[PDB]
Amino acid sequence: DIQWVLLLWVPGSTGDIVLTQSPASLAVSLGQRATISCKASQSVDYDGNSYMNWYQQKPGQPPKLLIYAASNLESGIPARFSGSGSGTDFTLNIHPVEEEDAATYYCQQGNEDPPTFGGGTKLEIKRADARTVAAPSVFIFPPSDEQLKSGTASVVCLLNNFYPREAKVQWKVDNALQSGNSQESVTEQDSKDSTYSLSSTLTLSKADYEKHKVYACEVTHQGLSSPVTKSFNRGEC
Amino acid sequence: FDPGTKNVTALLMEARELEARVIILSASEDDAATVYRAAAMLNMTGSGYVWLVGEREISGNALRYAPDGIIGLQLINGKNESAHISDAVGVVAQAVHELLEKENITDPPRGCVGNTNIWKTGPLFKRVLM
Amino acid sequence: DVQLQESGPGLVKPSQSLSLTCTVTGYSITSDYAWNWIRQFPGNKLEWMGYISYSGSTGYNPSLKSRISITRDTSKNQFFLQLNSVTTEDTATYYCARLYYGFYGMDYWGQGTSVTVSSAKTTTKGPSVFPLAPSSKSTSGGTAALGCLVKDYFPEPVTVSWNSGALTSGVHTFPAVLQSSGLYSLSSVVTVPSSSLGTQTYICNVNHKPSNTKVDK
Structure with a gap:
């Protein structure tokens, strides 16, 4: 119990x-x-x-x-x-x-x-030491403009081979104030390949995407604190 | 104009015909977003048009359709409650100090409820504090 | 200044009015930010929420556009909520903080309260008084099996603390699947310390949001 x-x-x-x-x-x-x-x-x-x-x-x-x-x-x-x-x-x-x-x-x-x-x-894989690093496979899916009219946004970003324990996605936007923003979407843990990714889904409307800056899921964890800013130019998909 | 204008396109068409392009909105954020959408619909946002607005006019929901480049005047010492309060306290202290150093420092009567306590040196006190 | 502490009650009765108290106490509350909670639940996605203003725009989604009524409590620079008839996917980790209007991202650590759907009587059963027994025998490496065993109290998403500010080298929260029986066996553990030999005691004192109890052992 x-x-x-x-x-x-x-x-x-x-x-x-x-x-x-x-x-x-x-x-x-x-x-x-x-x-x-x-x-x-x-x-x-x-x-x-x-x-x-x-x-x-x-x-x-x-x-x-x-x-x-x-x-x-x-x-x-x-x-x-x-x-x-x-x-x-x-x-x-x-x-x-x-x-x-x-x-x-x-x-x-x-x-x-x-x-x-x-x-x-x-x-x-112990990717929190000075021997191995946790390379984040940044992959941003382009959201369609028709989907934004209903309120759903396909702005998911892959975070393969990240730090599953300390998941702190430090966004490098010009202005962002939030004490915790990360969608819990980690898959099952594996010891063969360890390709689990955190799908941080920042669902926003169409008018919200206009004022939103360049969506760049920059990963800054304790394992590999390397600046990986993938400039993804928003537009009609 | 009156708040709640629906035919905002005619206003933009009239402003475009005139030589002036200084569009000033200081009513609220709803009308600001409305005129921003009206300007973006005709592709006349920033192309020679002057957009001088404040922080109150862009707060809430007003920048959801305005592109990056709108001149937004931030309200300095208008909403902060950490240093603006101390600045106001210091200003009031300096003001009352300079007023005490000058003349017209007569103490007004006890302004209690149910009694007429109109200060006879009201205008003089305001002129000294000015 | 910059205070984004989520002091909202994270444990209420099922189908009860959730008075989420978001004590921001920052720069200003007079229609400057959005101040909305994010629906981060493992299993599904979220939707574009609303934003409150000086007039008290209590409409986030078209379903609950007029159902809830956010009371504007300008006395303490905060506001209350009236979330009634909440579902499972709606009730998730809440982030009622100073959310900047624009939905850009974040630049801080992971905080916020996560209200559950468990009954108050089921969760509250009495602090398990268990003496801290140092192992001092599993000398394997830098990290061993040693820590507190306090259970039978408020849910995991609470203000976890230590014995009057102990070593916090490697502390990080992670919302997991909650238990329906109410026997939340929350117990934090540190990596480098509390794994040595001798008599070093590392008893934890997990504080609670609606109880503020830090005397249980």
């Missing part, structure tokens, strides 16, 4: 789970030792070790139970996980980091409430 079935990722820093580990992407990525473990500071240890259900919840792929009660492994999955840890934290070192093991592991507890979800961090 605490958390329902949400097939999403960690909601940034202020996540909706009390079992999260890191606000941004995990420091250790695919290629070395990656440890995933939730937290439980309540009466969970019943009859010895707690009953936590370990499964790889990948966005788009159904999760399969591989380790139950954090002590014994589940049949069907090869023994490739270090099922150690007791008490409060249950460490799970992931050395075989393949293209499918890099998923979010929700520690489903079966002591307080069976239908719950744990924490875990989605392993993706």
